[PDB]
Design a protein around this ligand. Structure first.
Ligand code: CQ9
Ligand code: AKG
Ligand code: FE
Length: 288
């Protein structure tokens, strides 16, 4: 069984996207420092606790796919400083994304979410991402460059026993799905702050939590070309929060215009030839 390639965020930076493009998965060791992990966890903790089941009856966009033992919290910018400052500005994240998406243009956050799995959470079925949100992706030519990638960052230990993610290496290029089986998977064993990076075509699943004891938590960052609509909205984020971010983080959250890679690109989310941020006179890097 070939295992998932493991790479250093600092020392092997230029190899990360090529490794994923080839094998469909890679593990980025120390993607986030333990201190960032700590702060993020502390900041999102109470929002995770009050989050109801994915399909809650009070929701008008219930998630019917995720297990009732899963809690998912997105739109993290208003609730986490570590997320909106450190994570959205990660140099490692942006080098990988610009490596990946140069053919298309700008990229942004399709979804940044904290997912927590209760003890005895069952394994997910093997799947590709984006199929419950972007049916357009299924109509792309089989060899089109990936239009989104997913960083699954461990916020607690990933072990075989506690349900570490399964991936099928090379499955991002599969056209024929008859060999799909758990027998074809390897695991993503990870320390907190390590990240599993996959594309939108990589076949993977969350694993079964078999201890009955441990609570596994992750930060999933789906980065995608700016030509695709995010799964989440930042439209309700307070203006003072948005104006405390970097221009780059503002763009990632849909608070800036966007560009394609067409040589004579006419742009996305523009206003009569001017950007959102020029039109609104949007401040940046202003501490609250
Ligand atoms: C239901 N959905 C998610 O909610 C989700 C969660 C985090 C990040 C992305 C994301 N989008 C997905 O496409 C999908 O995970 C796919 C899935 C398929 C089968 C079982 C469980 C999940
Ligand atoms: O739980 C995991 O490790 C993977 C979660 C996942 O793949 C999803 O919800 O789409
Ligand atoms: Fe998934």
């Amino acid at each position: 069984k070939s295992q998932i390639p493991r790479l250093s965020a600092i020392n092997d930076l230029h190899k990360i996207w090529p490794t994923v493009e080839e094998h469909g998965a890679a593990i980025i060791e120390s993607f986030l420092s333990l201190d960032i992990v700590r702060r993020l966890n502390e900041e999102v903790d109470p929002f995770v606790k009050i989050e109801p089941i994915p399909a809650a009856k009070t929701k008008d966009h219930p998630n019917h796919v995720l297990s009732t033992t899963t809690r998912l919290v997105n739109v993290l910018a208003p609730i986490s400083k570590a997320y909106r400052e450190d994570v959205l500005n990660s140099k490692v994240l942006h080098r990988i994304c610009s490596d990946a998406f140069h053919v298309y243009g700008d990229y942004w956050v399709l979804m940044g979410a904290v997912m927590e799995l209760a003890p005895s959470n069952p394994a997910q079925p093997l799947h590709r991402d984006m199929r419950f949100s972007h049916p357009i992706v299924e109509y792309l030519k089989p060899d089109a460059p990936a239009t989104s990638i997913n960083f699954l960052v461990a916020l607690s230990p990933f072990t075989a026993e506690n349900g570490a993610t399964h991936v099928i290496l090379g499955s991002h290029k599969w056209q024929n799905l008859s060999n799909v089986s758990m027998d074809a998977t390897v695991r993503a064993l990870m320390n907190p702050g390590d990240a599993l990076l996959i594309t939108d075509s990589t076949i993977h699943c969350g694993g079964a939590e078999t201890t009955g004891t441990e609570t596994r938590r992750l930060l999933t960052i789906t980065m995608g070309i700016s030509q695709l609509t995010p799964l989440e909205s930042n439209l309700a984020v307070p203006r003072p929060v948005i104006e405390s971010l970097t221009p780059l983080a503002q763009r990632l959250l849909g608070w800036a215009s966007q560009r394609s890679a067409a040589p004579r690109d006419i742009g996305l989310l523009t206003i009569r030839g001017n950007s959102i941020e020029k039109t609104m006179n949007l401040k940046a890097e202003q501490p609250l």
